[PDB]
Design a binder for these strands. Structure first.
Ligand SMILES: [Mg+2]
Ligand SMILES: [Mg+2]
Ligand SMILES: [Mg+2]
Ligand SMILES: [Mg+2]
Lengths: 49, 154, 145, 102, 112, 116, 48
RNA sequence: CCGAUAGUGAACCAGUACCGUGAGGGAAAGGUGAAAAGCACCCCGGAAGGGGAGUGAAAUAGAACCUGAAACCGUGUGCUUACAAGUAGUCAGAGCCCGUUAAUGGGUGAUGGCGUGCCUUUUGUAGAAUGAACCGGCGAGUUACGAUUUGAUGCAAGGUUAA
RNA sequence: AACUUGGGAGUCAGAACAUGGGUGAUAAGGUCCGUGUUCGAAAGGGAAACAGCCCAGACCACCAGCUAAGGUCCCAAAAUA
RNA sequence: CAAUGGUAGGAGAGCGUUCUAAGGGCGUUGAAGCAUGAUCGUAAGGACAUGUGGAGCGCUUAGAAGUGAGAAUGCCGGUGU
């Protein structure tokens, strides 16, 4: 296959989900973390267990 | 925000001034401040299983043989480096603007001759790589290199 | 936006109509007169231009009232001053300045838009058989109610 | 003198010599479209069809099958971070009447 | 046809220069000069000189004699402002914008 | 590789400033308010594209009602009579028949008065 | 005691409608023909 | 990898203006043209400026000098407006001017209908809850290593190498 | 439709009406439960205006038609039936 | 033939910005920017013509990211009232 017409294997690649870029993406304002609490903070969350 | 010069003093008090609360003159929102999550020194290389590396050299070589771009020549026998002459060899062999020449082991004169012809790269039979076979529209392999490449890759 | 006629001032013709208020109840005459001068009886009615006719009411003192709102039915009106409320009963208007009674009952039945004012200005109410508008050749109108 | 026809989902009043705009049809440029759903033929001779006037058809040449001007549908709900922008263009036909029947 | 004359970075705030130019707009040259020389404002001497230059320009470059000239149009627009400060009370400093003006005047013979 | 957001913000803001062409005062030169007013405009338009259908419907009603009473018959009875007769003519068209062709309106009013 | 809001360009230009300088009270001088202020001495000639 | 709000704090006499008693803190500021050919003379003006003529491909390239946006300030005007109650639009529409990326066209809009900005935060906000004077630029889920799951691809009772 | 296994979550401040009860005073736009509905997260018509009431869920046109709650003298479409 | 209000949120398809690889192109007979326009697509957006502008820049496929701003009493610079 030519180097200027190549194609990747079907379904092998997928574009990743950028977060916090506009409302239309569906993850706009809160970046999918809800509103408040530890989950909504940077380095938040709780230790596993 | 740790590597930008200075920036250690709380620029003003926390309450009372009517200004937004700030903690360093080198915070990301500030002109002249630290960058959040940009480029960092890193490598980009990965690896694939060995057998898969071999099916990729063979696939490029088999693609080449399908498109009729594999010219096996017997030997080259250049005795001195001269570029006009390698250009001749290629034109009398009717090879496209882009060709990859494959010698048996290092052939110094064949290499010094095709270094300047724009569009030609010279490679040993063991140094065959996919990016090079796939750019090249045509190949020219020495019969000795052709028997070596059959032994190694299969 | 296909084909509905729109009246404009090159094709509006307004006529004059004398209505007599003798023996007519206030509301049941005022509502009809408001419909007249609004132009809602013109088959060529148009909401955004003043179609509709002129109306002269002439007796305007032979109005009758149902019930006993002779003494009730007090009109109020304010002067924008503190304590500036002034009121007057309907009978007192009917004997003193009866033209205003009808001229205020009808204008309350029209919108308050600018078209509303320019339409209410098409009304001339007089309190006695004679009207001073014989030059506009007013045809008599009979109350359909 | 004037006929009233029923096309698409609406009705139109027509007299031969006029250009009209109706929903999209399946006929091509320059063709002749004949309507068979006529409901009133008025003017000097009036025919009031009960549902339709039987027999009266209306024939018109077709031209300029096109798409209307782009209405841009936009809607939003305040404080809810929700909006939608769509664009729309109704298709239509320009018809010119050339004959009437009764 | 039209003579031009411009004064740049004049040291008068444009709101103040325009008050005097709102009088000589469209008047004759002689009447315009008589206004300026008699209006008792600060900008007036500096405009009487821009007018003078235009009129001289007209005579020396176009043979446009000054008896028939009219200030076709005359205006003034902002210039490169100079920023300064005034020491006010309680250690605070307020700003003072010393403005400037780009005065333009064109006089015409009304002809082509 | 850094990318600087030049020449993407300009066009996006300009094609809303231009789209607010002709709004009062400061609503046609500032992005931050032009955008709000354009949003509101789209919302209003979406409502009015529905309201129109009913405003013109009741316009035709008023015209038909005025026309009917010239023949001593009211709109309710008129429409009921055409329903009885089987006549199916829109209010738009009946309004136009009343304006243009008085004889024809009279004729179908009789055919509806006789459909009692 | 502070402006609760901006004064738009419309309001601004509206307020200053009456803010203007009047053309001087000038009349022509009888000895020299140059303009002078009325009731003042001509500064070009020096007359009356 | 960055191209002058970036990349050094510092592309330019920068750890310098500057600030502090002192430790210390700490900026802003690149671009005429190919060549300086950097505008001989004339005209107004005391000068700054300007307007011709000339240099140059270009001088709205004239030294604050490449391109030159927006806020903002002006000068003209085509259409409107001095009885009106306006989150300033939409929708319906006369009149008056204009004529295109020719398409069921552009500008303004008498008069009618409907209609209390946006964000955040909330049970609920036109809200007199919070946030933004306005324009522009910059400004927030990335990377390293490891686990888990899914898709893909080798080849499979085997698969795979690390230094 | 339901269930099982696995990947990803947000939610732990509710509100008003109707109805069964506690608490209060057969007080509250009160408070705590149960059971609907709606709002939350719902535009549209009615209730003058009026998140929670009544009717009804908006894919996008149309200057087509029929109706629900509410209505039909004028404001303001329809009976001065 | 059926479905298409929607917030926390899950899933999918995409539009754009810089750079790189290859292929194929455009450019003082005027590139990128800038301004205007009554143009095209379902949207993110894409062209075309005319002016200013005086040298670089598109298109196809694929790769990587300092990739998209309107709000943080955000920072810097201009300009208002
Ligand atoms: Mg002091
Ligand atoms: Mg507020
Ligand atoms: Mg307020
Ligand atoms: Mg504030």
């Amino acid at each position: 296959m030519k180097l200027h017409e190549l194609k990747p294997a079907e379904g092998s690649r997928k574009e990743r989900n950028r977060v916090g870029r506009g409302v239309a993406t569906g993850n706009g304002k809160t970046s999918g973390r809800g509103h408040k609490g530890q989950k909504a903070r940077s380095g938040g969350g709780v230790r596993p267990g | 925000r740790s590597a930008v010069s200075g920036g250690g003093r709380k620029p003003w008090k926390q309450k009372g001034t009517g200004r937004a609360r700030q903690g360093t003159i080198r915070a990301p929102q500030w002109r002249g401040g630290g960058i959040v999550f940009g480029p960092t020194p890193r490598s980009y290389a990965y690896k694939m299983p060995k057998k898969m590396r071999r099916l990729a050299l063979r696939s490029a070589l088999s693609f080449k043989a399908q498109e009729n771009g594999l010219t096996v020549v017997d030997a080259f026998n250049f005795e001195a480096p001269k570029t006009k002459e390698f250009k001749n060899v290629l034109s009398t062999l009717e090879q496209p603007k882009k060709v990859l020449v494959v010698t048996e082991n290092e052939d110094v004169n064949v290499e010094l001759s095709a270094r300047n012809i724009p569009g030609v790269q010279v490679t040993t039979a063991q140094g065959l790589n996919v990016l090079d076979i796939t750019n090249a529209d045509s190949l020219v392999i020495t019969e000795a290199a052709a028997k070596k490449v059959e032994e190694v890759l299969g | 936006m296909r084909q509905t006629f729109m009246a404009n001032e090159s094709n509006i013709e307004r006529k004059w109509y004398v209505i007599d208020a003798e023996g007519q109840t206030l509301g049941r005459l005022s509502s009809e007169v408001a419909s007249i001068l609004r132009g809602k009886n013109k088959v060529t009615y148009t909401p955004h231009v003043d179609t509709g006719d002129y109306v002269i009411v002439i007796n305007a003192s032979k109005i009758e009232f149902t019930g006993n709102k002779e003494t009730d039915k007090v009109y109020y009106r304010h002067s924008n001053h503190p304590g500036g409320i002034k009121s007057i009963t309907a009978g007192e208007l009917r004997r003193t300045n009866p033209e205003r009674l009808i001229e205020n009952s009808i204008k309350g039945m029209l919108p308050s838009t600018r078209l509303g004012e320019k339409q209410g200005k098409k009304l001339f109410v007089y309190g006695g058989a004679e009207h001073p508008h014989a030059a506009q050749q007013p045809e008599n109108y009979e109350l359909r109610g | 003198m004037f006929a009233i026809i029923e096309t698409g989902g609406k009705q139109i009043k027509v007299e031969e010599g006029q250009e009209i705009f109706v929903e999209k049809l399946d006929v091509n440029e320059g063709d002749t479209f004949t309507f068979d759903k006529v409901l009133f033929v008025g003017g000097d001779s009036v025919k009031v069809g009960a549902p339709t006037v039987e027999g009266a058809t209306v024939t018109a040449t077709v031209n300029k099958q096109g798409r209307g001007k782009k209405i841009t549908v936009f809607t939003y709900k305040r404080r809810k971070n929700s909006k939608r922008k769509k664009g729309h263009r109704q298709p239509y036909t320009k018809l010119t009447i050339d004959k009437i029947n009764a | 046809m039209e003579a031009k004359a411009v004064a740049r970075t004049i040291r008068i705030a444009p709101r103040k220069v325009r008050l005097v130019l709102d009088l000589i707009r469209g008047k004759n040259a002689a009447e315009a000069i008589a206004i300026l020389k008699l209006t008792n404002k600060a900008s007036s001497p500096v405009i009487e000189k821009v007018l003078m230059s235009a009129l001289a320009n007209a005579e020396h470059n176009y043979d446009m004699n000054t008896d028939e000239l009219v200030v076709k149009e005359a205006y003034a627009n902002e210039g490169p402002t100079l920023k300064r400060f005034r020491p006010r009370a309680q250690g605070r400093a307020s700003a003072i914008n010393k403005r400037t003006s780009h005065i333009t005047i064109v006089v015409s013979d009304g002809k082509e | 590789p850094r990318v600087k957001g030049g020449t993407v913000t300009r066009a996006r803001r300009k094609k809303t400033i231009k789209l607010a062409k002709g709004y009062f005062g400061s609503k046609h030169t500032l992005y931050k308010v032009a955008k709000q007013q354009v949003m509101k405009s789209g919302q209003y338009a979406f409502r009015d594209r529905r309201q129109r259908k009913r405003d013109f419907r009741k316009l035709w009603i008023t015209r038909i009602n005025a026309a009917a009473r010239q023949h001593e018959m009211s709109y309710s009875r008129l429409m009921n009579g055409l329903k009885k007769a089987g006549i199916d003519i829109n209010r738009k068209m009946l309004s136009e028949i009343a304006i243009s062709d008085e004889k024809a309106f009279a004729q179908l009013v009789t055919k509806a008065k006789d459909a009692l | 005691a502070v402006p609760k809001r901006r004064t738009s360009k419309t309001r601004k230009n509206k307020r200053r409608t009456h803010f203007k300088i009047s053309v001087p009270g000038m009349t022509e001088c009888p000895n020299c023909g140059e303009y002078k202020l009325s009731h003042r001495v001509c500064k070009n000639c020096g007359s009356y």
